[PDB]
Design a protein around this ligand. Structure first.
Ligand SMILES: Nc1nc2c(ncn2[C@@H]2O[C@H](COP(=O)(O)OP(=O)(O)OP(=O)(O)O)[C@@H](O)[C@H]2O)c(=O)[nH]1
Ligand SMILES: Nc1nc2c(ncn2[C@@H]2O[C@H](COP(=O)(O)OP(=O)(O)OP(=O)(O)O)[C@@H](O)[C@H]2O)c(=O)[nH]1
Lengths: 197, 1057, 163, 326, 49, 50
């Protein structure tokens, strides 16, 4: 509640000025998807540190993507239509072949570690029985194992499926730069001097 | 010093370790040290932790495993203090030991490990094709030729390029990186030209003029703003490099031009690149705030184009449109030709344009750091103005600038305990004189004193004048900073004045430290308190004068009188706490215990007695003059009978009052008492009230009575005023060369582009105007400007209006200052007592010069920098005769001045004094033209010669100020000496050599034997109040004390014909 | 010494910051200092903690969210000694940085932000009609003539007064 | 970088005038050599060394060490007004109170003041301050202003030196320490040569360090620096003014102008401080009126002059230190 | 709101003198059709900048 | 507002009562299960109130 009050007193949204600084709204308000095409951003995803709101910032840091920004090289060689001057695609995770340990899965372990101490702090705050606590923890460990299982399927197989599809002919837009804080889609319009765009 | 000289070397290739050192590049055995292995700083007031690695590690892509190390969670263990060094060290050490770059060791001396590619392969756990390349062939990182270090990788991989991420140099800043480098296959120049042409097609991309490892690489930005920040930092580095290339210094920089080229960019980047090749900035050694650099460079750009000549404007536009081209001076290109002829294989940015001629634009001041600018506006400049529009100044918040009425004192501690004293002069008091003096006294009392003098007396209160000083003494004490001072010293008494607590000493010098958790409250001084302590000191001093310890002798009593004297008595008591058996009684109306409450007349039964008395009783506000007379006489009689050494206040120091006091004392004690007219530095500066020091002595006093005394004169000359006193206005509009401004200030603000205009118009009224901007964000410049009458006296002699407007334009926008913090200014600023006195002379003379008829010219002799000009009316012509003054002929022509840069010749025969003129020798005869003091006989010869020269002339008038001998005997007695003091019998006015004084009787004697008519005159109280109210000046604490004596004993000699 | 002489000036209008300073009126970069940003005293023998804000902040309507800040629970961490300066400073700093008055920045030199109305709209989370006025038109707080600073609000709102 | 003792950087040497007269026929030759040296500028090599061997970087390791010992609490004992004291004030941007006559007050815990930011000309300014206190007395151990005495440093960007002088004299009552010059920030007043005709500076000490305008006719730089010397001389009993172009003609014409300004000749001397950049041909002149009539007022074949005069424009582009491998 | 305050400060209505210049009331007041037959005009339609 | 100030006030009230009941229950050695149940009841009141 207190970290929330600090956070939301900084404001629920922000814009990025020409200087590139994030100017926060300073005003609590619900987001609507209308704003998605606006100059506004949800503030939770600014990744701008805020004193006294650290736990919120950290739990937010859990959401940062584990992939990379590929260039659609094959689509370019084929002269497939691409609205961007430098066409690209955010592949959700890199291939990771030589490692003993999958970096994506290890990331999920750190996320689950963080959520674990979060749920723990909450449960001790609310005087939960040790048995239920142990059970949520067991559930989290299970999620870690399951994730370590599927991780190779994602990072090492599905990733290539993404890399191909990004080169398909009609996949013409740039979807995401991989940085939530700043990314907005380029917004083209058809524009008649007569009617509305 | 023409041709550029520099060494070109690739710092990046130099940085890359030989393969044998890679195993131990982690400093595995020895712990990391500040200023070598790394450097760290915490920033107070911003709460940031900046850690930068050094050596090869300054360039490092951290693995996600690397950020999982504790060293990066260290800032999280805080806010707020700096991270402890032992922990930062243990962590950084463990981390560095954790990294293990893949490499092959080798015997060959020519190899360097390719640190960049090996680090990058590590950061991605060797998953990227370059990574798995590094893994199966670690030896591919070794290279002898720097370009092949990348070519071998590009050909092994079949790739056209590699995109290397750049981490922030601070490694605690884990946030999105602004851009990334992209190494390209190149290696022929032709391949580079091709890639540069193809990058015009891409989006936010830039390059350097030349490339490390001789390998083309480009920057690719996440956003235009990131490109702007980078382009700015580079424009700054190239401006700073060009600054020392043009200065002829040897330079070891990697490339001749450190500016970026926008291969594809926003419009703002194009304008930044345009203004970066024009090199607008003047050389500066000041620290700059990098964080807002871009904005500064944008604003600079916006101004540079905004006021450049049309050809320079078009040139800027040409650069702005051909942003891909690299503009550069000829000498730059000579440097490039040099480095090409040295290493023919080198790749330089191909599309360049050499400036056949460098632009002649004005250099811009650009100090973006803290601190306001205090401009000294010159009266004239190259720019000519014609009917300029009024520049309205916007209202400013109290957050930016507060305007207190009166500037607080900034004296040393001892300086407020000083006193001056005017000894009696005349040997008799004839009844016929008593009639006139009594009539002048009753007349002055019935009509009261000047309303202006009273306004200043009540506005410039001493307590508020000394408050910042006393509070600091208190604040240092409670924080434990003070601990060493002599007992009985003025610092001790001032400490007792400052703090309401007993102050024991541990040993003779050390002060006892305060018990923990205990902070005593500040002493509550009422307005008259500092004066009381000052008079206590004065009485100890008159007792001895050689004294260092102002402390009562054991078994000795002092009795302060007057309303509300409690704080002073408590201070005196705590001050004498270590002295055995010291009575320190108080009295007076409204007294609280300890002080007895009593009223004048004292009850007839009452029998006060002491070895010291300090009466500070006020006169009853409303009574017949005979009533106040009998009251104050009864007071003086009581205080005199009560103690061997009284010090009694006189509220109405008329010659009649003080002399009648001496008479009453004479008939009381038989023989005359040794009286003296004291005035302490802790009195309110404008007070005409004056203390009298009474004491019986074995010697029979000669000249018991006062006449024409300074202390008396301050009161007597404050005749009731003819005009309601001027109130310090704060003007906002700045009319162009309009004379009409009541004295005051020009507080306000205006857009930065209009700042040069405002300063150029301000100079008509203000000798100097301070300016600043609150931040790089604000477009407004706040400005304050005192209105000095002297400047008005200069600037309105002619209708011509000119200013250094072209120079002021150089300030915009970053040359006018910056200050986030609140600033306080005052309607009444402090000035040296001597300056105030000079203004008093100038007013005393100006009031007369306006009166005299048919005077064709005023001629100042030795009046440096037109110092005397305030006296001369604007229509009358003004001649100056001083070697020291230097003026362009066009300036004197512009202002109707006529300077003669020759020494004035004091010989009587060749001294060609013109008829119908007013000569001015104010404060010049005491000194030789080179400034050395003249002997007094030489001054007598000077006055004799100017008088004899005046003998033939008609309608001529001359004013000749000179210091009088009497002041010396005064200042030998007095302890005040902040700005005026005796020095081996000569008085030393501050910033001047001490000069021998003249005797007034000998001067009037020689003047009356020469036979020329003359009057001795001094500036009076109305002149004081005139100069102060007009110039916006307040008298200082010490200044109020010294000013009466210093002014009275510096007579003007008014010769006339 | 008969006729009264005085300067009349509206200290309250002087207090109100220009709009450009409102973003940094919180002293966001530098830490607050005694005798400037604020002044505090503990009163021994009465056990009271008196903290007064200075500058524009001397006049401030705290939000209920503002009282939820630790800085106001500080006196509760005692009796009896004075609050340690480092804690009073860190708390007051964090709090001041927490406030963000709504405003429009502007080039014109004649404007002052109407600090009273903007603070009041903040304290009520912009629920009051003056508050929602401040939200849809933050620029209405800027004023050159001090009276019109309130007249514009009274006419936009149709109200005869504001308490 | 230099490795000197602390006092060693405050030293100065001075070349006194030698010749008793300045014949006009000599003035012709000296003026011609002066205008010739000015129009062609000085040697490119001498300029390269003058700009590469900057004094600030030469003294940086020394000053930083004085700072680093201070913040770590290692220093604690030195005389007030001593060169170690002034060097400490040069090193550290904070007020430095003394507890007793010798002990320095230990820093409050958790507080480490930032290093003072010295620009290149700062050490020279302190060096000239010391030089002026020394020329005043020479027997002096405590370089500290007498109470109620003022000094006024001139020149662009003199702020750090003034702050250092002020903090150095913090225990001395009533010491004005004004600055002036172009690009001045408050406290220092911003002004430009020629000084405004209304302006009236005055002090018991003056240190002009104003640079000449980079591009002007020689007669222009001449009139400018003459106006400077005249201003500084009238302003103070003990001036120390920089001469950027110390030709025999320039310095002697300065002595002439001073002679016709003060009647009797001033006791001039050609000072050169140890905190100047080592290769600098710029030289200070110490002007002061004296009761005695000066014999040999003028300079001829002087060393300080010779460093400038012998730097005739060079015949060959200066050698650049190669790093050989084979 | 701010343009509104300015506009209504000029007046919610105006009349037209014999000269043909508009003269705004300076007063905010609700219009009524009682006014349609009067000298007054609603000021929103004055088209005076 | 994103959040109802009245409801948030009830959250602070329930927070205070929660630590009150807790202090009492630890004073009287209550079983952890019953404690958890009163806490759950309070959280439920907060939701209902919101
Ligand atoms: N990750 C990584 N980046 C590097 C390495 N070496 C150079 N870079 C980057 O390459 C870029 C191009 O060089 P410059 O920006 O011109 O050089 P610089 O490091 O900023 O140094 P200066 O230009 O002299 O101020 C820089 O932004 C560096 O951060 C490296 O070894 N590893
Ligand atoms: N909430 C709030 N109240 C204000 C503000 N400005 C002024 N006030 C109140 O308005 C009231 C009327 O002003 P005064 O009482 O005459 O002025 P003052 O603040 O007491 O100052 P002095 O009268 O000079 O002692 C005061 O009680 C203030 O507290 C503001 O910005 N916000």
């Amino acid at each position: 509640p207190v970290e929330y009050g600090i956070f939301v007193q900084r404001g629920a949204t922000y814009t990025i000025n020409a200087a590139g600084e994030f100017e926060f709204s300073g005003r609590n308000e619900k987001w609507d998807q209308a704003l998605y095409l606006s100059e506004h951003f949800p503030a939770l995803f600014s990744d701008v540190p805020l004193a006294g709101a650290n736990t919120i910032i950290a739990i937010m840091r859990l959401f940062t993507p584990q992939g990379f920004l590929r260039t659609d090289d094959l689509a370019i060689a084929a002269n497939f239509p691409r609205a961007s001057r430098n066409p690209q695609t955010y592949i959700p995770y890199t291939n990771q072949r030589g490692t003993v340990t999958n970096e994506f899965a290890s990331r999920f372990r750190t996320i689950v570690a963080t959520l674990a101490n979060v749920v723990n702090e909450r449960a001790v705050q609310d005087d939960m029985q040790k048995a239920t606590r142990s059970c949520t923890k067991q559930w989290l460990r299970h999620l870690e194992t399951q994730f370590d299982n599927i991780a190779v399927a994602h990072t090492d197989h599905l990733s290539v499926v993404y890399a191909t599809m990004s080169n398909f002919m009609l996949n013409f837009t740039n979807n995401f730069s991989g940085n939530h804080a700043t990314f907005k889609p380029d917004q083209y319009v058809i524009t008649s001097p007569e009617g509305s765009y | 010093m023409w041709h550029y000289t520099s060494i070109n070397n690739d710092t990046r290739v130099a940085l890359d370790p030989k393969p044998n050192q890679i195993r131990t590049i982690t400093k595995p055995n020895t712990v990391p040290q500040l200023g070598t292995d790394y450097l760290y700083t915490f920033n107070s007031q911003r709460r940031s932790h900046t850690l930068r690695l050094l050596g090869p590690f300054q360039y490092f892509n951290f693995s996600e495993t690397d950020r999982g190390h504790p060293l990066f969670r260290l800032p999280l263990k805080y806010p707020s203090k700096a991270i402890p060094a032992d922990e930062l060290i243990d962590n950084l050490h463990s981390w560095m030991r954790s990294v293990h770059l893949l490499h092959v060791r080798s015997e060959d001396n020519t190899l360097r490990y390719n640190w960049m590619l090996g680090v990058y392969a590590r950061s991605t756990n060797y998953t990227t094709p370059v990574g798995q390349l590094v893994v199966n062939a670690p030896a591919i990182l070794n290279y002898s030729n720097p370009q092949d270090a990348f070519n071998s990788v590009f050909v092994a991989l079949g790739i056209d390029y590699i995109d290397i991420p750049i981490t922030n140099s601070n490694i605690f800043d884990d946030s999105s990186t602004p851009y990334n480098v992209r190494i390209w296959h190149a290696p022929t120049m032709t391949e580079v030209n091709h890639i540069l042409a193809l990058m015009r097609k891409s989006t936010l991309v830039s390059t350097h003029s030349s490339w490390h490892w001789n390998v083309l690489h480009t920057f690719h930005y996440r956003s235009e703003s990131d490109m702007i920040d980078h382009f700015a930092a580079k424009i700054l580095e190239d401006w700073r490099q060009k600054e020392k290339l043009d200065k002829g210094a040897l330079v070891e920089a990697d490339r001749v031009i450190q500016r970026l080229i926008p291969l594809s960019s926003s419009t703002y980047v194009q304008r930044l690149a345009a203004i970066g090749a024009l090199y607008p900035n003047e050389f500066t050694e000041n620290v700059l705030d990098l964080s807002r650099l871009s904005t500064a460079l944008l604003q600079l750009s916006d101004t540079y184009y905004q006021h450049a000549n049309d050809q320079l404007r078009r040139l800027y536009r040409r650069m702005y449109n051909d942003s891909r081209t690299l503009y550069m001076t000829q000498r730059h290109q000579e440097l490039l030709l040099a480095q090409i002829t040295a290493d023919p294989n080198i790749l330089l940015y191909p599309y360049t344009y050499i400036f056949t001629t460098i632009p002649t634009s004005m250099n811009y001041i650009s100090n973006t750091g803290q601190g306001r600018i205090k401009h000294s506006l010159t009266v004239t400049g190259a720019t000519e103005h014609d009917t300029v529009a009024d520049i309205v100044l916007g209202q400013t918040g109290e957050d930016v600038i507060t305007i207190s009425m009166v500037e607080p004192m900034s004296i040393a501690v001892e300086d407020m305990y000083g006193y001056v004293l005017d000894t009696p002069t005349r040997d008799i008091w004839p009844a016929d004189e008593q009639i006139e003096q009594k009539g002048d006294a009753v007349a002055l009392y019935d009509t009261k004193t000047s309303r202006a003098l009273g306004m200043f007396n009540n506005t410039v209160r001493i307590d508020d004048l000394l408050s910042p000083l006393l509070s600091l003494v208190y604040r240092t004490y409670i924080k434990g900073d003070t601990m060493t001072m002599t007992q009985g010293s003025l610092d001790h008494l001032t400490l007792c004045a400052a703090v309401d607590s007993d102050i024991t000493f541990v040993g003779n010098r050390m002060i006892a430290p305060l018990p923990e958790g205990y902070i005593p409250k500040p002493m509550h001084r009422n307005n008259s308190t500092m004066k009381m302590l000052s008079l206590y000191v004065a009485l100890k001093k008159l007792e001895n004068f050689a004294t260092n310890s102002y402390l009562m002798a054991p078994d000795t009593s002092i009795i302060l009188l007057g309303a509300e004297r409690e704080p002073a008595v408590n201070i005196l008591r705590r001050f004498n706490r270590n002295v055995s058996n010291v009575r320190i009684i108080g009295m007076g109306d409204r007294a609280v215990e300890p002080n007895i409450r009593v009223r004048v007349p004292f009850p007839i039964d009452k029998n006060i007695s002491a070895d010291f008395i300090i009466c500070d009783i006020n006169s009853y506000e409303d009574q017949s003059f005979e009533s106040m007379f009998s009251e104050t006489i009864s007071v003086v009689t009581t205080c005199a009978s009560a103690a061997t050494r009284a010090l009694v206040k006189i509220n109405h120091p008329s010659e009649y009052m003080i002399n009648s006091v001496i008479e009453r004392l004479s008939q009381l004690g038989g023989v005359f008492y040794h009286t003296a007219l004291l005035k302490t530095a802790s009195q309110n500066p404008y007070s005409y009230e004056t203390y009298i020091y009474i004491t019986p002595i074995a010697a029979a006093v000669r000249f018991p009575f006062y006449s024409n005394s300074a202390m008396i004169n301050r009161y007597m000359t404050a005749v009731a005023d003819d005009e309601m006193p001027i109130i310090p206005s704060i003007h906002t509009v700045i009319k162009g060369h309009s004379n009409t401004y009541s004295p005051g200030l020009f507080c306000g603000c205006v857009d930065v582009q209009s700042a040069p205009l405002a300063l150029s118009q301000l100079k008509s009224y203000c000798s100097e105007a301070t300016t600043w901007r609150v931040d790089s964000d604000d477009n407004l410049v706040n400005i304050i400007a005192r209105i000095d009458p002297a400047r008005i006296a200069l600037e309105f002699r002619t209708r011509s209006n000119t200013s250094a407007y072209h120079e002021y334009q150089r300030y915009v926008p970053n040359g006018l200052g910056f200050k986030v913090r609140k600033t306080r200014e005052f309607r009444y600023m402090h000035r040296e007592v001597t300056f105030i006195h000079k203004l008093m002379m100038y007013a005393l003379i100006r009031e007369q010069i306006s009166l005299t008829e048919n005077m064709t010219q005023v001629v100042s002799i030795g009046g440096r920098n037109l110092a005397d000009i305030s006296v001369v009316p604007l229509n009358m012509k003004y001649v100056v005769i001083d070697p020291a003054t230097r003026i362009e002929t066009l300036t004197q022509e512009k202002k109707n001045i006529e300077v003669q840069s020759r020494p004035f010749q004091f010989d009587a025969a060749n001294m060609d004094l013109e008829n119908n003129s007013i000569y001015l020798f104010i404060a010049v005869i005491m000194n030789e033209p080179n400034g050395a003091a003249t002997p007094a006989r030489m001054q007598m010869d000077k006055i004799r010669n100017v008088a004899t020269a005046m003998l033939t002339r008609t309608n001529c008038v001359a004013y000749i100020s000179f210091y009088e001998a009497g002041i010396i005997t005064r200042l030998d007695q007095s302890t005040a000496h902040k700005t005026i003091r005796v020095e081996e019998g000569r008085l030393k006015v501050a910033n001047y050599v001490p000069v021998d004084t003249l005797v007034e009787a000998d001067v009037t004697l020689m003047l009356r034997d020469i036979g020329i008519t003359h009057e001795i005159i001094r500036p009076s109280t109305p002149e004081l109040i005139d100069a102060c109210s007009n110039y916006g000046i307040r008298l200082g604490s010490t200044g109020g004390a010294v000013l009466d004596v210093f002014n009275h004993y510096s007579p003007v000699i008014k010769l006339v014909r």
